């Protein structure tokens, strides 16, 4: 998701 | 005995509650996100905090956590003196309010690197504790406690 | 060595207890999670690094070393992520003895707690406050303060 | 429940 805690 | 004194603080964002413990002499903090502020959540947070630093006294954030027999049970278990959070020094209200505003500001500066609020809050704890104001709060708390141990 | 930590993952009651050990003091932080994932390990390292000055983490296995989520958190928090190969074979034994001690303590409290997570935090408290002498909680503050000064 | 985390 392009987030540190959800790279997807 | 001021190396061991902490203050609880509860603030709200995104319909959730951020519970914070502040080490009064250094301004170091620990924090967590919980869905609402219950005696059970507060008690567990304080058990966590006291296993990690030498917590002598906690000033509770409100009268419900001071009354809570679950919170009193955790403070008995962990050997903490549970006290009220009356700002006998009115400078305490301001310090806590300015702290909450700073943390919310940091949270907004990171909020989009994190899918969940809890990640952003821990990023804000990291930034707050490492900020040099020059020593950082994380250096002040270790200095203060080591000085006490020696 | 003031900034060196080792991850360790042990299992109880069908759940996983993730531990970080500060190698020079033996102080520990730990949590209960339903299973070890890169996301859970990454969040625990972000928590740890906001609370102590974490320079290096030796990961507990090769999946956490490889995980790009764990690498992302170690980048975020400024931690050097390293393997956990026991080049000193004494590391194997120290971690295993630690896990046995924690489970012992957990059994000694387990009946004061409804949930395993409370018992694990009681065990963290007893481990870090135990005088072995000084306690691990005293040792870690001593070591870091000495380094700051 | 007579537990620290559940006094009931
Ligand atoms: Cl609430
Ligand atoms: Cl697992």
Domain ranges of chain C: 1-149
C-alpha atoms less than 13 angstroms from C-alpha of C83 in its C-beta half-sphere: 4
Q: After which residues do gaps appear in chain B, with C to N over 2.5 Å?
A: 133
Q: Which of A1, A2, A5 to mutate to test the interface with B (most CBs of B within 10 A)?
A: A5
CA of C37 to the centre of ligand 2 (A): 7
User: Which residues have a Cβ under 8 Å from the Cβ of B142 and sit 6 or more positions away?
Assistant: C141, C144, C145, C148
CB contact under 8 A, D4 and C112: yes
Resolution attained, angstroms: 1.7
DSSP 3-state of B82: strand
Pairing of strands C15-22, C27-33: antiparallel
Pairing of strands C4-12, C15-22: antiparallel
Domain boundaries C1-149, CATH class: alpha beta
How far, rounded to the nearest angstrom, does the alpha carbon of residue C96 sit from its chain's CA centroid? Answer: 13
Q: Which residues of B touch A5 (CB under 8 A)?
A: 114-116, 119
The reply to whether A4 touches chain C by the CB within 8 Å rule is: yes
CA separation for the pair B29, B103 (Å, rounded): 10
Tokens of B54: 């030498």
- Longest CA–CA separation in chain A, Å: 9
Around Cβ B4, how many Cβ atoms within 10 Å? 20
Contact C15, C33 (CB under 8 A): yes
| Domain B1-150, second-level architecture | 2-Layer Sandwich (3.30)
User: How many angstroms separate the CA of residue A2 from the nearest CA in chain C?
Assistant: 11
């Amino acid at each position: 998701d392009l987030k540190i805690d959800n790279l997807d | 005995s001021s190396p061991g004194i902490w203050q609880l603080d509860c603030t709200h964002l995104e319909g959730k509650v951020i519970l914070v413990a502040v080490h009064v002499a250094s301004g170091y903090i620990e924090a967590e996100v919980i869905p609402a502020e219950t005696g059970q959540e507060t008690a567990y947070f304080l058990l966590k905090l006291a296993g990690r630093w030498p917590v002598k006294t906690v000033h509770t954030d409100n009268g419900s956590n001071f009354t809570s027999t679950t919170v009193k049970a955790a403070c008995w278990w962990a050997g903490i003196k549970q006290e009220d959070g009356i700002p006998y020094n009115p400078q305490s209200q301001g310090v806590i309010e300015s702290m909450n505003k700073e943390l919310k500001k940091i949270i907004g500066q990171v909020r989009d690197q994190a899918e969940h609020l809890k990640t952003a809050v821990q990023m804000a704890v990291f930034i707050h504790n490492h900020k040099r104001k020059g020593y950082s709060a994380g250096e002040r708390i270790v200095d203060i406690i080591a000085t006490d141990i020696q």
